[PDB]
Amino acid sequence: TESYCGPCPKNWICYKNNCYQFFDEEKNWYESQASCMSQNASLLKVYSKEDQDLLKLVKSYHWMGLVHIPWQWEDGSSLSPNLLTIIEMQKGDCALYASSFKGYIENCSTPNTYICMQRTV
Amino acid sequence: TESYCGPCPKNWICYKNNCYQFFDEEKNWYESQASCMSQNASLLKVYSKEDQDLLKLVKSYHWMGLVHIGSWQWEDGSSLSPNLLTIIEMQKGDCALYASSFKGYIENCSTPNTYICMQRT
Ligand SMILES: CN(C)C(=O)[C@@H](NC(=O)c1ccccc1-c1ccc(C(F)(F)F)cc1)c1cccc(N2CC(CC(F)(F)F)C2)c1
Numbered sequence: 001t002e003s004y005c006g007p008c009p010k011n012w013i014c015y016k017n018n019c020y021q022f023f024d025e026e027k028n029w030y031e032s033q034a035s036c037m038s039q040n041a042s043l044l045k046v047y048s049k050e051d052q053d054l055l056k057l058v059k060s061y062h063w064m065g066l067v068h069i070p071w072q073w074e075d076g077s078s079l080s081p082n083l084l085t086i087i088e089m090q091k092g093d094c095a096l097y098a099s100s101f102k103g104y105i106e107n108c109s110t111p112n113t114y115i116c117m118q119r120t121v
Numbered sequence: 122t123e124s125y126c127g128p129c130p131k132n133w134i135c136y137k138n139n140c141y142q143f144f145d146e147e148k149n150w151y152e153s154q155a156s157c158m159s160q161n162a163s164l165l166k167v168y169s170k171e172d173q174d175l176l177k178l179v180k181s182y183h184w185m186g187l188v189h190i191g192s193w194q195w196e197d198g199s200s201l202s203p204n205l206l207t208i209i210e211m212q213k214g215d216c217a218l219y220a221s222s223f224k225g226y227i228e229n230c231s232t233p234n235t236y237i238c239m240q241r242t
Pocket residue numbers: 013022054057058059060134135136141142143173174175176178179180181183237
């Protein structure tokens with residue numbers, strides 16, 4: 001069964017109506033979030049294994065919008081249970097997405113590649 | 122700017138109105154083409170570095186619809202457009218794998234590989 005996907009910027013990938021782009025110019029977590037925001041987007045938010053199952057194929061390690069206030073997303077929403085396996089790597093309050101549905105804890109100041117995500121409406 | 126992409130099946134990636142799905146189960150070229158056909162699709166066709174620029178982000182190597190039976194040709198009978206793929210000899214064979222960035226590996230058609238299906242309209 002066919003359907004349209006989006007809306008999305010023409011240069012971003014669309015999957016199940018969410019829009020994704022990969023950025024290989026490395027930035028710390030804050031600068032990555034600011035970059036996504038400048039594109040009317042935010043860092044990757046993981047909210048559904050079913051709607052975001054393409055993330056199983058996303059390799060390497062990329063900033064996502066998950067933060068620990070001493071885990072929650074940039075928008076202030078809570079991390080849903082049964083979504084991500086969180087593993088320590090570098091002492092820090094931020095997290096890198098890795099396959100499959102893993103989060104590696106990382107110092108927010110460490111430069112990394114990142115994934116921006118847009119959704120209209 | 123924001124636009125809709127597709128149409129595509131709900132479980133496929135949409136990019137610039139083309140639909141892509143990756144298959145992790147290793148199959149030879151013939152079985153991979155049959156699998157794509159069962160989903161009303163074909164193996165990946167590469168026709169434009171601009172319309173398909175994010176093929177540069179694909180990791181590993183995967184069957185595409187390029188075959189030697191003349192020059193190399195696609196499943197649909199069309200010719201390979203010049204200045205699109207760097208063709209590299211890897212195995213004795215009449216089939217080709219896609220690898221980034223815009224490379225085609227000549228490969229034995231009987232070798233099991235992962236594959237990419239593509240649909241348009
Ligand atoms: C950070 N990155 C970039 C990754 O981990 C990378 N992973 C693998 O390529 C990848 C890695 C392992 C196994 C398969 C793949 C893969 C193969 C084909 C496709 C297909 F079917 F899309 F071709 C997608 C993934 C990635 C993840 C998610 C999407 C992409 N995309 C490139 C765009 C291609 C399109 F044609 F749609 F524009 C979408 C790339």
